[PDB]
Design a protein around this ligand. Structure first.
Ligand SMILES: CNC(=O)CN1Cc2ccc(Cl)cc2[C@@]2(CC(=O)N(c3cncc4ccccc34)C2=O)C1
Ligand SMILES: CNC(=O)CN1Cc2ccc(Cl)cc2[C@@]2(CC(=O)N(c3cncc4ccccc34)C2=O)C1
Ligand SMILES: [Cl-]
Lengths: 305, 298
């Protein structure tokens, strides 16, 4: 019993964190095999950030301008290339702690663990979701650039995010491990703002099924809804549209609890209309949207209470 | 910017998790040097009567794919210590520490000696923890990391009928009035950790949330008379002193913030949130707030 925002054990990722320095800029890098991946803005000054020409800044650099520190050992850079917004530094030593890994690009609504690092040293781990507006509500200070997001499955680490910047609203933007940004953001200090954020509907539904599994049904009602009527109501509360794919994905949770997806949608509609009336759901007074259907199945018991 | 329930990096603890099996019972053990520590209920009660009927070969200890050989066994309170023939090469620098209610720690939840998740939690004033544990989680450990030294403070034993959790320090002494056996056990009425709610209100002010601040102050006694009515733990002079740094960083006196908390208890939040929450959060200590708003690494 219980329901917590659970992160993956971070050990496999801790053994990959290194410190990368170029001139006066210092940030984190991910050391996998003989390559260190880090944000390309390590080659920038603060002035350069307004309109940086990364190709012009990179061509003026040699291998020995990049200082890479792994623990107390200095790694030697023997090559460098840029791939989108990520710099790839070829080093002379393969990481003996390299786990089994994949680079995966995630979609909005998907969750992942973040290992927040400063000076190549991990400081904390937390769980978060890729918001529909492609930002993440993380906890990052200056020097956290290069910190990574990941999931773990059967000892294979799937790297999905690398931290690049904080937007004026305090939210965070970054790239996949191929250097392609999530969202319409650029690694430029330009007037860019996150789009209006929305609630991840399929995740709120999954969390309502998690509450049922753990023994709570106060919020259920005798009504059902059509998918279209649910979406017309949900859009009014800034909730993301629920698609047939979402309904299909909620199938296992519907079978484990005996509650049809459109019946759970009718309960969500009523919760949006009435609020919680001094009651909580899994220890929360707000409708939680950072647990996916997969996360609920992973954390919760296979036997409903 | 941002404020999250952050756990310590779990790597140093992952390298200590093993699976312990005795008869039909399987649970998690902590392998430090040549000793595996695990809950004594693995032998299940008259524990030193069940223990004398066991030999070393009855305990199967599995570290990854390797089988460790047990060469000795002894009991310390509710914890069983299994002497093994191999010292853990991944043993970190460590201490066993007993924490007090209100203190927080990271939990590495394991099943069959394999870590599955890490989360942060607090020791409640009623000595229980609101964790997320399923059957097979026994022996999962709680810890804090301070300068590459891991301080082990909790070992999971059981779940109470309300869904909350109970366990011991690493010396086998239970937190709370509990026993390791199937009997009528219930957690006492819980209270809110006041010094932690105040620390989290300071974290909100640091993060640019100030709607709840007011021009008023209060005495410590008047605050405690009000707080006692909402099932909040009494705030002591020690708590005020501990909040001193946060009071100086934000310019808001502790008793000045106590007057904001009093108004929040008496009026609610009025449809507003604080750090994305509609409830007053009490699982961040003053030290957790300072650490997360500073950048301390391990
Ligand atoms: C909030 N941003 C700024 O004050 C200026 N920043 C412009 C800028 C523009 C583009 C890019 Cl790709 C990087 C960056 C910087 C580089 C950097 O370290 N960050 C940060 C990252 N995460 C969290 C932070 C929290 C506080 C202060 C800085 C943070 C940035 O956003 C710097
Ligand atoms: C609720 N538990 C029971 O019905 C039986 N339990 C007797 C028992 C008696 C003494 C001791 Cl010290 C432990 C235990 C068990 C062993 C064990 O793994 N647990 C559990 C731990 N965490 C979370 C759990 C979630 C669901 C079911 C069991 C959980 C127990 O409490 C099992
Ligand atoms: Cl995805």
């Amino acid at each position: 019993s219980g329901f917590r925002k659970m992160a993956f054990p971070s050990g496999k990722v801790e053994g990959c964190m290194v410190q990368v320095t170029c001139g006066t800029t210092t940030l984190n890098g991910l050391w996998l095999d003989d390559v260190v991946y880090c944000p390309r803005h390590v080659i920038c000054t603060s002035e350069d950030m307004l309109n940086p020409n990364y190709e012009d800044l990179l061509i003026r650099k040699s291998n020995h301008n990049f200082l890479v520190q792994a623990g107390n050992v200095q790694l030697r850079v023997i090559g460098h290339s840029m791939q989108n917004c990520v710099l790839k530094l070829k080093v002379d030593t393969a990481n003996p702690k390299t786990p089994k890994y994949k680079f995966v690009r995630i979609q909005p609504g998907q969750t992942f663990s973040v290992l927040a690092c400063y000076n190549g040293s991990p400081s904390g781990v937390y769980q978060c979701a890729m918001r529909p507006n492609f930002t993440i509500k993380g906890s990052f200070l200056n020097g956290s650039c290069g910190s990574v997001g990941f999931n773990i499955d059967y000892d294979c680490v799937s790297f999905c995010y690398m931290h690049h910047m904080e937007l004026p609203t305090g939210v965070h933007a970054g790239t996949d491990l191929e250097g392609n940004f999530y969202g319409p953001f650029v690694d430029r200090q330009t007037a860019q703002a996150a789009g209006t954020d929305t609630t991840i509907t399929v995740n709120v539904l999954a969390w309502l099924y998690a509450a049922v599994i753990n023994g709570d049904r106060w919020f259920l009602n005798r009504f059902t809804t059509t998918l279209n009527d649910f979406n017309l109501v949900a859009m009014k509360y800034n909730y993301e549209p629920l698609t047939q794919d979402h309904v299909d994905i909620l199938g296992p949770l519907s079978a484990q609890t005996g509650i049809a997806v459109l019946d759970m949608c009718a309960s969500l509609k009523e919760l949006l209309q009435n609020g919680m009336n001094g009651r909580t759901i899994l220890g929360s007074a707000l409708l939680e949207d950072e647990f996916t259907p997969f996360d609920v199945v992973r954390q919760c018991s296979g036997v409903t209470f």
